[PDB]
Amino acid sequence: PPNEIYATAQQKLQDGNWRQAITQLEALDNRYPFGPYSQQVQLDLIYAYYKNADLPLAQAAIDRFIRLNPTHPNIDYVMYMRGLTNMALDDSALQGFFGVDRSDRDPQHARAAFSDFSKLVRGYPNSQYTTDATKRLVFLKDRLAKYEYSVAEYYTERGAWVAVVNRVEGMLRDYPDTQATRDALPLMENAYRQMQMNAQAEKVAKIIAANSS
Amino acid sequence: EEDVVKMSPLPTVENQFTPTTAWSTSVGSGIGNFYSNLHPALADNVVYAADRAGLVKALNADDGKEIWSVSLAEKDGWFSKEPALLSGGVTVSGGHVYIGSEKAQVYALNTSDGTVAWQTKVAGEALSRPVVSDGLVLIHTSNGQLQALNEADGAVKWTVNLDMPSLSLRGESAPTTAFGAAVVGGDNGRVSAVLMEQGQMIWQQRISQATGSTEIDRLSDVDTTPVVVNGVVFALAYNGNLTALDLRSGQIMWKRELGSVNDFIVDGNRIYLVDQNDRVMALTIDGGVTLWTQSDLLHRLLTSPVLYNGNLVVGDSEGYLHWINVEDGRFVAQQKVDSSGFQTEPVAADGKLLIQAKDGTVYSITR
């Protein structure tokens, strides 16, 4: 009886518990060949997995959904949800360990989330989620920058000045518009100064003296 | 054994007569409950028997005596003594007893303390009966090979290569001699006949259809001797394909669907055979008409049904000797002289019948 299980699922999903509000959805999914009447079920399932914090299973289901019907009047919601799933993997908490987060830890989830939100923004700029993605995207470009800044700090503490200058080059070539790059110009100046590269040091000096922070 | 049906009830017909002057001597350690080709052969009314660990003995006609035990363990590891697995059975000819082994050794020993035996390396382990033909002892070794040996020590040895099915059921395919030519079943349904002098004119015929047909884990093996009648050989694959073949290197294949593991016996104008499920049936000399079927010993270890006094004598896995009539296949006499079953072909010759047992309790029948 798909109609009554779907109706009960909607009513106990809107204002009900979510632990067993995916059970009838997955029972409908296993029963059906994923053919007719399953698009709303799949979208409801992705939303339920997200807000139930089932991030890897939601990501697997959304990876499956994108290839089945890459053309859809709600594929923008799908890609936006995929970016949200990666950014929620980026922020481990709830018995997790944090304090400054992926500004100094694994940035692969943030980088995947950035690629996905960039696919939103340059695929469907007229979508009503894109602004949110466009302003999430900025945070991630700051996030991904702070990561390399920590590497540019640690090698500065170590004296690996080739590593410091190459990391700050990575900044200026990939993240030139962010704050963590501005914080990293003094490290490139220092690394050039502990070498006899005083021309490169004064060349970075005018950049850091371009009223930048 | 296949357990397609459950073990069927066995009706008992009491026989007030037991075989006379009948002895049950234990040969070696016995073969146990494992199936192999080790079965005594009688020559000069003298029984020759063999067992694993290379243990060969002989027995006299009545109250088996002249028991000369010979243990063959030489050339089987010069650092330790190990049981040379004999699995080629016993064939007797010209006072020479030929035995195979699973260390690729063919033993040929003599009468009257044949401790002095000549042994030959054969490519692959020897598992079939070393059948004799025109002064050559030829053997089908489970490397898919056919080899020939001379009677004295082996000087004219020629190899015939067969198909490699890579999945086998203990190739027991002992060749048969017709018109000076040896005809054998293959290890996967390639019945071939070759002459002597290098075994030329190698021609193969396909009989089995279960080889390479998604039925292969260890199935589709022709483990039966292709008995020749009137220039016609009868080949039985493991699964179906009971085919009749003409010994003129022809391509005419006419067949009936029956699969077996043990030898079929053709007597007069009749055929008695045991299927792969251990039930006996009878058929015409030419054709596929099932004259009768006895269904009273299903999936109980049965050997080749041997004809003694015009009566089918068979041995089950619980040590009952069954005399069965040969017209409709009904039990007419039952004897219990052994409490252990039988898993090796009995032999009927020289007015005697020889049955070898799991425990080596060789029983003699003189009715």
């Binding site: 936006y80 922020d91 960039s118 700029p125 | -």
Partner: protein, 51 residues
């Protein structure tokens, strides 16, 4: 959302100026954020209900 609020928290991004006689590194990175002229859905309300 499932985690903390993350679509209002941000930091403004600003270009770096190039002093004459030299240039910034060629910004060939694929982390460019294209400009959007859409209406905001940011704040507290964001409908992520599957349509």
């Amino acid at each position: 959302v499932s985690g903390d609020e993350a679509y209002l928290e941000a930091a403004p991004l600003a270009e770096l100026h190039a002093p004459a006689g030299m240039i910034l590194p060629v910004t060939s990175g694929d982390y460019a954020i294209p400009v959007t002229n859409g209406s905001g859905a940011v704040g507290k309300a964001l409908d992520i209900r599957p349509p």
